[PDB]
């Protein structure tokens, strides 16, 4: 059976399970069950399922080299699908809540969930809570007797936490750290001293890389009972590297990809985000360019945003991007080679993850 059709069938099975359990154990009525079904579909479906399919892909790689009964192969693949859906649902939780937090308008060419007329922020915040709770309901139901349950829950938990910490790093990235204070409304930075590569790296490493690359890889390993076939420090290093490159690409697209292709109108400039573009621009600009950057960044005024975009163009950031890209290719290939020592199979799965990221 092809991997994606297996993955999507398991969504239907997991959906039915969660809703059936709401009716039998949580006293839900048909109308609220229908709302939750619609919310699940709208928030969990319609992306590429890269995260969840990674779990499946890693597991398939091991199946090709490991002896098992057919019923075991099916059980491992089912497990990988369930684990993949845990990660998709975790992502859906963070996208719902992040869209609310950020006042976002669109996501994948449709309105953000909270903006649906029959939702509202009041419900949406809670809907995003439920999305994450479902991850745990899935785990406890499908993996109850599994030897990996402990390690899976502990990992999931650490990744979730890392993500929320990353969210904090991101939403506070345009404030001066020394002025953070719950009692005092936060001014935007005037000096931009904290727009550095290392500070940027910390934002991206926590906010995206742990749940986008680390978790799918290591979950694939746990449902395969294969974690002792890898050097876990390598898996972390390669995850964080590829995840960083992914976020840089996202940052560049926010500014330069036409909205109809982006699925939204990008506002990182108006939001004064610590983006790869802003940090790389500041690492090469002259005094007058920095000054003009500071006069225009982090302002809704479209004239000011057009000025920032122009500054980035004239600064030939495309060439810094190619140079970053080249270095990432070196490092990711080096880590892939190192992973071949203990597992050629796992190494190949990381190669596939890298190709899918590097091309898109």
Ligand X SMILES: CCn1cc(C(=O)NCc2ccc(F)cc2)cn1
Binding to Zn ion, residues 139-198 (CB under 5 A): none
Residue 268 labelled as part of a binding site: yes
What phi and psi values does residue 186 have, to the nearest 5 degrees? -90, 120
Shortest separation between residue 235's beta carbon and its own copies, angstroms = 17
Residue/partner pairs of 312-315 with CB below 8 Å, 24 or more apart: 312/255, 312/277, 312/281, 315/281, 315/284, 315/285, 315/289
Tokens of residue 162, six digits: 């890392």
Distances in whole angstroms, Cα of residue 359 to Cα of each of 256, 301, 353 = 17, 34, 10
Shortest separation between residue 170's beta carbon and its own copies, angstroms = 9
* DSSP-derived 3-state class of residue 344: helix
Among 98, 292, 325, 348, binds Zn ion (CB under 5 A): 98
Span near Zn ion by CB under 5 A; candidates 96-104, 233-241, 277-285, 331-339: 96-104
Closest Cα to residue 93, out of 128, 121, 51?
128
With binding defined as CB under 6 A, does residue 319 bind ligand X?
no
Closest Cα to residue 331, out of 341, 343, 323?
323
With binding defined as CB under 6 A, does residue 333 bind ligand X?
no
Among 324, 348, 356, 358, binds ligand X (CB under 6 A): 324
Among 112, 248, 274, 305, binds ligand X (CB under 6 A): 248
Among 146, 201, 237, 294, binds ligand X (CB under 6 A): 201
Contact 18, 40 (CB under 8 A): yes
Shortest separation between residue 168's beta carbon and ligand X, angstroms = 17
As a residue count, the chain comes to 360
With binding defined as CB under 6 A, does residue 244 bind ligand X?
yes
With binding defined as CB under 6 A, does residue 210 bind ligand X?
no
Shortest separation between residue 108's beta carbon and its own copies, angstroms = 16
Shortest separation between residue 298's beta carbon and Zn ion, angstroms = 15
Contacts of 246 (CB under 8 A, 6+ apart): 208, 209, 212, 213, 357
Annotated binding site for Mg(2+): 98, 102, 170, 250, 254
Annotated binding site: 98, 102, 170, 236, 250, 254, 268
Q: Which residues are at the interface with ligand X (CB under 6 A)? A: 197, 200-201, 204, 244, 248, 323-324, 327
């Amino acid at each position: 059976m092809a991997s994606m059709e297996r993955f999507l069938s398991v969504y239907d099975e997991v959906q039915a399970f969660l809703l059936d359990q709401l009716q039998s154990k949580y006293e839900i009525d048909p109308n609220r069950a229908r709302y939750l079904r619609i919310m699940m579909d709208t928030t969990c479906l319609g992306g590429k399922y890269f995260r969840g399919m990674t779990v499946v892909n890693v597991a398939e790689g091991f199946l090709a080299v490991t002896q098992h009964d057919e019923a075991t192969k099916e059980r491992i693949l089912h497990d990988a699908c369930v684990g993949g859906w845990m990660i998709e649902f975790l992502q859906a939780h963070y996208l719902v809540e992040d869209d609310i937090m950020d006042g976002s308008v669109m996501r994948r060419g449709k309105p953000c969930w909270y903006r649906f007329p029959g939702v509202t922020t009041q419900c949406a915040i809670n809907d995003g809570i439920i999305l994450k709770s479902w991850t745990q309901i899935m785990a406890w139901h499908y993996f109850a007797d599994r030897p990996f349950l402990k390690d899976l829950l502990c990992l999931f938990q650490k990744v979730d936490y890392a993500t929320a910490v990353g969210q904090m790093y991101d939403v506070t990235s345009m404030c001066d750290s020394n002025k953070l204070d719950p009692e005092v409304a936060q001014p935007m930075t005037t000096d931009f001293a904290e727009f550095t590569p290392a500070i940027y790296k910390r934002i991206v490493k926590y906010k995206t890389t742990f749940y986008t690359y680390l978790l799918p890889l290591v979950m694939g390993l746990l449902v395969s009972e294969a974690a002792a076939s890898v050097e876990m420090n390598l898996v972390e290093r390669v995850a964080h590297l590829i995840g960083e490159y992914f976020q840089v690409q996202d940052d560049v697209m926010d500014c330069f990809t036409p909205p109809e292709q982006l699925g939204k109108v990008g506002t990182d400039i108006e939001d004064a985000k610590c983006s790869w573009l802003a940090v790389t621009f500041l690492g090469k600009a002259n005094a007058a360019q920095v000054a003009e950057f500071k006069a225009n960044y982090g302002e809704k005024d479209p004239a000011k945003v057009a000025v920032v975009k122009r500054l980035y163009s004239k600064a030939n950031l495309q060439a810094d991007f190619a140079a970053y890209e080249a270095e990432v290719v070196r490092e990711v290939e080096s880590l892939i080679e190192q992973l071949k020592v203990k597992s050629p199979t796992f190494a190949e799965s990381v190669a596939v993850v890298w190709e899918k990221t590097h091309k898109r």
